[PDB]
Design an enzyme around this catalytic site. Structure first.
Site, short mmCIF file in Angstrom:
data_model
loop_
_atom_site.label_atom_id
_atom_site.label_comp_id
_atom_site.label_asym_id
_atom_site.label_seq_id
_atom_site.Cartn_x
_atom_site.Cartn_y
_atom_site.Cartn_z
N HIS A 257 72.42 53.33 14.68
CA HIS A 257 73.35 52.32 15.13
C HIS A 257 72.86 51.43 16.25
O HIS A 257 72.11 50.48 16.00
CB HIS A 257 74.69 52.99 15.48
CG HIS A 257 75.89 52.14 15.16
ND1 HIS A 257 76.60 51.45 16.12
CD2 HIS A 257 76.52 51.91 13.99
CE1 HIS A 257 77.61 50.82 15.55
NE2 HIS A 257 77.59 51.08 14.26
N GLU B 13 73.16 46.66 12.62
CA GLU B 13 73.23 45.21 12.74
C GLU B 13 71.94 44.69 13.40
O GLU B 13 71.98 44.16 14.51
CB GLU B 13 74.46 44.78 13.55
CG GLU B 13 75.79 45.08 12.85
CD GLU B 13 77.02 44.64 13.64
OE1 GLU B 13 76.91 44.27 14.83
OE2 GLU B 13 78.13 44.67 13.07
N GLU C 49 82.11 47.74 7.69
CA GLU C 49 82.99 47.57 8.85
C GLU C 49 83.94 46.39 8.64
O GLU C 49 83.52 45.30 8.25
CB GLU C 49 82.20 47.33 10.15
CG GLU C 49 81.38 48.51 10.65
CD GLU C 49 80.76 48.27 12.02
OE1 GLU C 49 81.28 47.43 12.80
OE2 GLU C 49 79.76 48.93 12.33
#
Length: 380
Positions: free
Chosen positions: A122, A170, A307
Site C-alpha cells: 500500500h 496507487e 476503492e
C-alpha cells in the site's frame, strides 16, 4: 431507525459480457470491503512496538468476529491494504516474521469464512524505504518489488484462487504537481507510466517464478495512481504472463467520482449534493465506467474498482442513492466494487467509517443494504 425507503428502485439494463473464466471469477467475488487504515498505517503519535501499526490509525485490533459480521452482511471479498516498508530491513528488504505472522492471521479470518482476499503493498511509495516510479529510482524500486513479493509469495504458497495479489496500490510521483492525475503531456508522468509498466511486469514475473498455486492465481495491476485514465490510456501495457496461463491479470482502478461530492470535505469547498435524476450528475459516475467497459470488460478482461465510497456529510439519503446507483452501473458492465472503510467516526478527517468495529455492526446500514441489493447475484 432503519429506513428502507431510502434505497432507490433501479432497473439498469445489463450489458453484454463474455462468459469466460475471468469474468465469472469476478462475479463470484460479489462485493468487497476494505480493512482500511489498519495494516496500511505507516506512522503514528504513540507507537511503542511494530505491531502497534495495526491500531495506530484504526484504534482497535482486528478480530474474527468483525470478519464474521462483514460476511453475514453479504460481502464476499475483503481487501487487506498493507504498508510493508516500516517492517522491512537490510539490503534484501527482509520482512519481519512478527508482522508477517499477524498479517497471515487476519488473512485466515477471511479464508476460513470461505471469502476471497486481496493482499497488496500500500503506502510503500518512498524513495529511500520503498519504491518510487521514476527512472532515477528503478534500481531500488525493482529490488523492493521483487524482494517483497518473493517473500509474500513464499509465505502464502499453499493458498488457492481465493487469495489474490495486488502488486501496487496507487503508484505515482509523490510530491510532483501531477501526483494525483496522469497529465499525458508532462514528460515526468510518461516516464512514470513506463516505470509502472516495468514494475507490474517484475511483480508478475517474481510471483509466477515461485510456481505451484502462485503460478495460476489471479494478479491485480493498476495504472498511474490507479486512476481509470491511468488504465485506459495508450501508454498502459498489460504484463506478459507465463505461457499456459490465460486471462489471469485483473486491472485495478480506484474511483471516488465525482471527487467534490465523494471525498472533498465541505470545509475545503466540497458539496453534499448529488442528484440521481440529473443527467450531468449521472454522467459523473458513468463516464469512467463506459471507458472501462469499452476497453476491457466488453472484451472479457476483468476489472475491479478496488476503492470507492462517499464521505459522511450528514447526507444519508443522498449517499444511499449515490452508492446504489454506483454499484448498479458497475454491475451492468461486469465490474466489481470494493468499499473503502477506515473506521473513522470522529467527525474529523476523512469520514469513510461504515462498519463500527467496536460494536461489530454497520452505522449507516441503508447504504450497505443498497450496495448488496445491486451487487452481483449468487447462484446458490
Amino acid at each position: 431507525m432503519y429506513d428502507a425507503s431510502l434505497i432507490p428502485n433501479l432497473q439498469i439494463p445489463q450489458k453484454n459480457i463474455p462468459n469466460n473464466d475471468g469474468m465469472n471469477f469476478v462475479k463470484g467475488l460479489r462485493l468487497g470491503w476494505n480493512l482500511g487504515n489498519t495494516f496500511d498505517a505507516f506512522n503514528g503519535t504513540n507507537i511503542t512496538n511494530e505491531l502497534d501499526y495495526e491500531t495506530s490509525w484504526s484504534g482497535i485490533k482486528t478480530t474474527k468476529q468483525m470478519i464474521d459480521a462483514i460476511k453475514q452482511k453479504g460481502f464476499n471479498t475483503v481487501r487487506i491494504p498493507v504498508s510493508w516498508h516500516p517492517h522491512v530491513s537490510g539490503s534484501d528488504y527482509k520482512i519481519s516474521d512478527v508482522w508477517m505472522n499477524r498479517v497471515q492471521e487476519v488473512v485466515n479470518y477471511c479464508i476460513d469464512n470461505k471469502m476471497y482476499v486481496i493482499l497488496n503493498t500500500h503506502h510503500d511509495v518512498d524513495k529511500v524505504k520503498g519504491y518510487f516510479p521514476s527512472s532515477q529510482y528503478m534500481a531500488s524500486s525493482k529490488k523492493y518489488i521483487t524482494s517483497v513479493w518473493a517473500q509474500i509469495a513464499a509465505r502464502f504458497a499453499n493458498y488457492d484462487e481465493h487469495l489474490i495479489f495486488e502488486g501496487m496500490n496507487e503508484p505515482r510521483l509523490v510530491g510532483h504537481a501531477n501526483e494525483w492525475w496522469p497529465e499525458l503531456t508532462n514528460s515526468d508522468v510518461v516516464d512514470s507510466i513506463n516505470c509502472i509498466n516495468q514494475l507490474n511486469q517484475d511483480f508478475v514475473n517474481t510471483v509466477r517464478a515461485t510456481g505451484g498455486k502462485n503460478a495460476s492465481r489471479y494478479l491485480m495491476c493498476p495504472g498511474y495512481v490507479a486512476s481509470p485514465d491511468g488504465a485506459t490510456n495508450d501508454y498502459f501495457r498489460m504484463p506478459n504472463d507465463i505461457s499456459g496461463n490465460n486471462n489471469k491479470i485483473i486491472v485495478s482502478v480506484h474511483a471516488y467520482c465525482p471527487w467534490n461530492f465523494a471525498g472533498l470535505a465541505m470545509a475545503d469547498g466540497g458539496t453534499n449534493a448529488w442528484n440521481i435524476n440529473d443527467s450531468k450528475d449521472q454522467s459523473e459516475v458513468t463516464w469512467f465506467m463506459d471507458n472501462i467497459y469499452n476497453k476491457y470488460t466488453s472484451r472479457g478482461i476483468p476489472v475491479i474498482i478496488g476503492e470507492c465510497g462517499a464521505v459522511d456529510k450528514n447526507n444519508l439519503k443522498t449517499r444511499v442513492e449515490y452508492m446504489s446507483y454506483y454499484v448498479a452501473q458497475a454491475k451492468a458492465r461486469g465490474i466489481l466494487c470494493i468499499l473503502w472503510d477506515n473506521n473513522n467516526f470522529s467527525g474529523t478527517g476523512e469520514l469513510f467509517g461504515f462498519f463500527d468495529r467496536r460494536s461489530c455492526q454497520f452505522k449507516f446500514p441503508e447504504i450497505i443494504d443498497g450496495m448488496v441489493k445491486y451487487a452481483f447475484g449468487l447462484i446458490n
